[PDB]
Design a protein around this ligand. Structure first.
Ligand code: CHL
Ligand code: CHL
Ligand SMILES: CCCCCCCCCCCCCCCCCC(=O)OC[C@H](CO[C@@H]1O[C@H](CO[C@H]2O[C@H](CO)[C@H](O)[C@H](O)[C@H]2O)[C@H](O)[C@H](O)[C@H]1O)OC(=O)CCCCCCCCCCCCCCCCC
Ligand SMILES: CCCCCCCCCCCCCCCCCC(=O)OC[C@H](CO[C@@H]1O[C@H](CO[C@H]2O[C@H](CO)[C@H](O)[C@H](O)[C@H]2O)[C@H](O)[C@H](O)[C@H]1O)OC(=O)CCCCCCCCCCCCCCCCC
Ligand SMILES: CC(=O)O[C@H]1CC(C)(C)C(=C=C/C(C)=C/C=C/C=C/C=C(C)/C=C2C=C(/C=C/[C@@]34O[C@]3(C)C[C@@H](O)CC4(C)C)C(=O)O/2)[C@](C)(O)C1
Ligand SMILES: CC(=O)O[C@H]1CC(C)(C)C(=C=C/C(C)=C/C=C/C=C/C=C(C)/C=C2C=C(/C=C/[C@@]34O[C@]3(C)C[C@@H](O)CC4(C)C)C(=O)O/2)[C@](C)(O)C1
Ligand SMILES: CC(=O)O[C@H]1CC(C)(C)C(=C=C/C(C)=C/C=C/C=C/C=C(C)/C=C2C=C(/C=C/[C@@]34O[C@]3(C)C[C@@H](O)CC4(C)C)C(=O)O/2)[C@](C)(O)C1
Ligand SMILES: CC(=O)O[C@H]1CC(C)(C)C(=C=C/C(C)=C/C=C/C=C/C=C(C)/C=C2C=C(/C=C/[C@@]34O[C@]3(C)C[C@@H](O)CC4(C)C)C(=O)O/2)[C@](C)(O)C1
Ligand SMILES: CC(=O)O[C@H]1CC(C)(C)C(=C=C/C(C)=C/C=C/C=C/C=C(C)/C=C2C=C(/C=C/[C@@]34O[C@]3(C)C[C@@H](O)CC4(C)C)C(=O)O/2)[C@](C)(O)C1
Ligand SMILES: CC(=O)O[C@H]1CC(C)(C)C(=C=C/C(C)=C/C=C/C=C/C=C(C)/C=C2C=C(/C=C/[C@@]34O[C@]3(C)C[C@@H](O)CC4(C)C)C(=O)O/2)[C@](C)(O)C1
Ligand SMILES: CC(=O)O[C@H]1CC(C)(C)C(=C=C/C(C)=C/C=C/C=C/C=C(C)/C=C2C=C(/C=C/[C@@]34O[C@]3(C)C[C@@H](O)CC4(C)C)C(=O)O/2)[C@](C)(O)C1
Ligand SMILES: CC(=O)O[C@H]1CC(C)(C)C(=C=C/C(C)=C/C=C/C=C/C=C(C)/C=C2C=C(/C=C/[C@@]34O[C@]3(C)C[C@@H](O)CC4(C)C)C(=O)O/2)[C@](C)(O)C1
Ligand SMILES: [Cl-]
Ligand SMILES: [Cl-]
Ligand SMILES: [Cl-]
Ligand SMILES: [Cl-]
Ligand SMILES: [K+]
Ligand SMILES: [K+]
Ligand code: NA
Ligand code: NA
Lengths: 151, 151
């Protein structure tokens, strides 16, 4: 057990209602988030590859395992995993983020933002309960503060 | 140095002319290869996650590093990496494939095939030199025999 695991449980309280409202079977997620821009996207994918090579290999292993278990507990019409697996996944991802330098994480966020159309967040939010999405995000902000403290 | 590295060099002789003919900047690769079928695709993605968790963590690390280096040497109008980086990537991927049980690799191939429209290989091949694609594939068959012997 660790502090990221404790923080993932609080994050789940704040975010699982949002998770249940996303339609994870929507084909939209395979689309570019705006105009397809292969050269810019490749730069973002490169920042991710750099980060994956920097990440602790045992923690990437554990984060993959957690996703395989989450897939096994999917149910209902939106394809949402169990509450327990939602928290497990978030904690395992938090540990991966904490295993690399902060600049590597920001480089991914910046490089993806560059290819992401300004309308995309609002359109995503419009398909769920707005208050639940806001509560999820304030949850994320509290969680990332625990993650940073392990980083 | 190892036998997979030697085999990757022969594979490059057989396949790099094909690599140069693919338009890696074509947006088509972001499309589902046929009808989008999220439940079946998730099963294929699950076989991959299982395989990634089973793979040797040092070899997955090295395979990511090899891709970051390959991205740095991209040139020309099709976005093709250098011959040296093409071989490096193939050897590092060969080592990853050899680090997991054969059944895990076949499970991915079967689960992806299930969502892949029968027209897709021929359409892909139609955008390149057919003889070069055939020479690439016969190269692959020789390479996978070396990979299997390390497996
Ligand atoms: C079928 C498998 C599968 C699916 C469908 C997804 C889906 C996703 N992954 Mg995951 N992953 C999957 C397998 C795996 N992933 C990962 C490792 C990662 C990493 C390292 C990351 C992702 C992230 C993401 C998200 C990227 C898009 C995004 O940011 O949306 C928005 C995100 C959500 C809807 C997820 C919940 C986030 C938050 C706790 C609550 C919601 C807050 C806000 C309302 C919206 C988000 C705001 C931003 C600024 C944080 C997306 C939800 C990324 C992500 O979520 O970025 C924030 C991310 O950083 N995945 C591994 C390797 C261990 C997997 C397999 O093993
Ligand atoms: C920008 C980054 C990036 C891009 C564009 C790609 C693109 C691709 N990856 Mg790669 N990857 C990338 C980063 C990374 N990959 C991987 C790990 C993997 C793995 C483990 C595998 C792929 C494979 C593939 C291919 C999947 C589709 C396919 O099978 O087409 C057809 C494939 C090609 C055109 C590639 C050349 C194959 C062969 C040597 C020559 C051509 C033979 C035939 C003519 C066509 C293929 C026949 C099939 C039956 C083998 C595709 C070419 C898969 C693959 O190639 O399956 C065969 C695969 O197994 N990637 C990692 C983690 C280390 C990456 C980042 O770090
Ligand atoms: C070949 C196939 C390969 C596939 C490759 C696929 C990967 C790339 C696919 C792209 C997917 C991107 C779409 C993501 C949208 C989700 C982000 C979002 O809604 O974000 C919403 C935010 C909203 O903006 C924020 O809005 C906030 C509002 O807060 C206010 O309001 C809050 C609650 O309402 C609180 O009150 C809070 O305290 C208060 O300040 C603040 O103003 C912040 O400053 C501001 O950042 O937008 C922002 O961040 C702007 C930046 C958004 C850019 C995207 C960021 C995602 C980075 C994640 C990296 C993952 C990469 C994707 C793939 C990885 C999978 C492994
Ligand atoms: C949210 C975003 C997340 C993104 C997720 C994305 C991943 C999934 C995206 C799907 C991409 C799939 C499209 C791939 C097409 C390439 C395969 C192909 O052209 O294949 C061509 C072959 C042609 O068929 C073969 O044709 C051969 C012909 O050989 C003959 O001819 C030869 C030379 O002409 C030689 O002479 C040879 O000796 C002689 O026998 C033989 O008959 C073989 O038995 C027969 O298999 O088709 C076959 O195999 C049929 C099976 C094809 C199924 C696809 C196989 C790919 C499996 C790779 C796993 C990678 C998964 C993809 C993503 C992974 C990235 C990490
Ligand atoms: C081989 C293999 O398994 O690889 C594995 C690799 C990983 C990394 C482990 C993995 C993973 C995680 C991944 C890829 C996550 C990807 C997330 C993608 C999110 C995409 C989104 C939000 C896309 C869009 C597109 C939208 C378009 C919106 C608009 O166009 C619309 C409607 C109309 C316009 O008028 C206005 C508009 C509003 C602009 C939008 O609103 O959102 C996975 C899945 O496991 C597969
Ligand atoms: C060896 C091997 O196999 O590697 C493989 C391993 C993987 C994992 C499968 C793999 C992969 C994918 C990877 C690395 C994905 C990485 C994702 C990174 C996500 C980062 C995020 C969300 C960062 C942020 C930063 C944010 C900042 C927000 C704020 O600053 C803002 C704006 C304003 C301030 O006022 C307050 C603030 C709130 C602070 C934010 O909100 O989010 C890959 C590439 O395939 C390689
Ligand atoms: C088709 C289908 O059914 O798919 C199903 C597939 C599944 C897997 C079963 C499934 C599921 C679950 C899923 C997808 C869960 C996704 C979770 C994503 C979690 C992401 C996390 C936590 C990302 C971050 C990024 C962080 C960055 C933090 C920092 O940068 C920040 C901000 C500010 C810096 O100053 C400091 C910092 C510390 C660097 C962080 O702290 O955390 C579901 C729902 O069932 C759908
Ligand atoms: C070949 C093939 O078929 O592969 C298949 C493989 C799969 C895995 C099966 C597959 C899949 C599934 C995938 C990747 C699913 C990804 C889901 C990502 C979902 C993202 C969502 C919800 C994003 C948001 C962002 C939002 C932002 C809200 C806010 O910012 C807003 C507006 C205002 C801020 O002030 C406050 C805020 C509240 C922060 C929100 O509310 O939500 C797919 C697509 O089927 C393809
Ligand atoms: C966060 C992050 O970085 O994730 C990283 C995760 C990884 C795994 C490391 C990674 C990687 C590798 C990946 C995903 C490789 C994906 C390969 C996809 C190949 C897709 C293909 C061939 C798609 C199609 C679609 C086609 C459609 C054809 C047709 O419809 C057409 C024309 C008209 C119809 O009449 C007939 C038809 C003929 C049916 C086709 O012919 O082909 C990457 C890139 O690094 C990103
Ligand atoms: C911890 C962590 O981070 O994990 C992350 C790590 C990654 C790597 C980034 C990641 C990923 C992606 C993964 C695993 C991709 C795996 C790809 C597997 C490819 C397998 C292939 C091509 C298999 C085959 C089998 C074939 C057989 C052909 C033949 O039998 C046939 C028909 C007919 C016979 O007569 C002759 C024959 C010729 C023998 C073939 O032709 O091809 C993931 C999911 O994101 C997790
Ligand atoms: C937009 C843009 O510009 O992107 C650029 C991005 C880059 C990265 C810079 C770039 C590049 C290079 C790329 C993509 C290279 C891709 C290489 C893929 C290699 C895949 C390999 C070897 C897969 C396998 C699968 C195998 C399976 C083998 C077996 O199953 C078989 C058969 C039969 C079983 O009985 C035994 C077995 C042993 C189990 C194997 O042996 O090998 C490029 C071109 O520049 C494009
Ligand atoms: C959000 C966002 O924008 O992300 C962006 C991220 C990126 C990385 C920048 C990006 C990208 C690039 C990607 C994934 C590229 C993937 C390329 C895969 C190419 C596959 C090809 C060529 C497949 C084939 C299959 C063929 C088969 C030929 C044969 O079988 C045939 C007929 C007959 C057999 O008898 C013999 C045979 C000879 C075997 C062939 O000849 O070729 C993209 C798309 O821009 C999206
Ligand atoms: Cl505890
Ligand atoms: Cl571009
Ligand atoms: Cl040698
Ligand atoms: Cl389906
Ligand atoms: K509101
Ligand atoms: K021919
Ligand atoms: Na470690
Ligand atoms: Na090892």
């Amino acid at each position: 057990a660790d502090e990221i695991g404790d923080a993932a449980k609080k994050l789940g309280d704040a975010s699982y209602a949002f998770a249940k409202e996303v339609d994870w079977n929507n084909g939209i997620f395979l689309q570019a988030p705006g105009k397809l821009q292969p050269l810019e996207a490749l730069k973002a994918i490169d920042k991710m590859i750099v980060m994956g090579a920097a990440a602790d290999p045992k923690l990437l292993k554990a984060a993959a395992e957690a996703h395989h278990k989450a897939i096994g507990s999917v149910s209902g019409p939106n394809g949402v995993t169990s509450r327990a697996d939602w928290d497990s996944v978030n904690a395992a991802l938090g540990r991966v983020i904490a295993s690399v330098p902060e600049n590597m994480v920001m480089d991914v966020y910046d490089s993806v933002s560059k290819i992401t159309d300004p309308k995309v967040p609002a359109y995503m939010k419009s398909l769920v309960n707005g208050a639940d999405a806001e509560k999820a995000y304030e949850g994320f902000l509290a969680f990332k503060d625990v993650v940073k403290k392990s980083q």
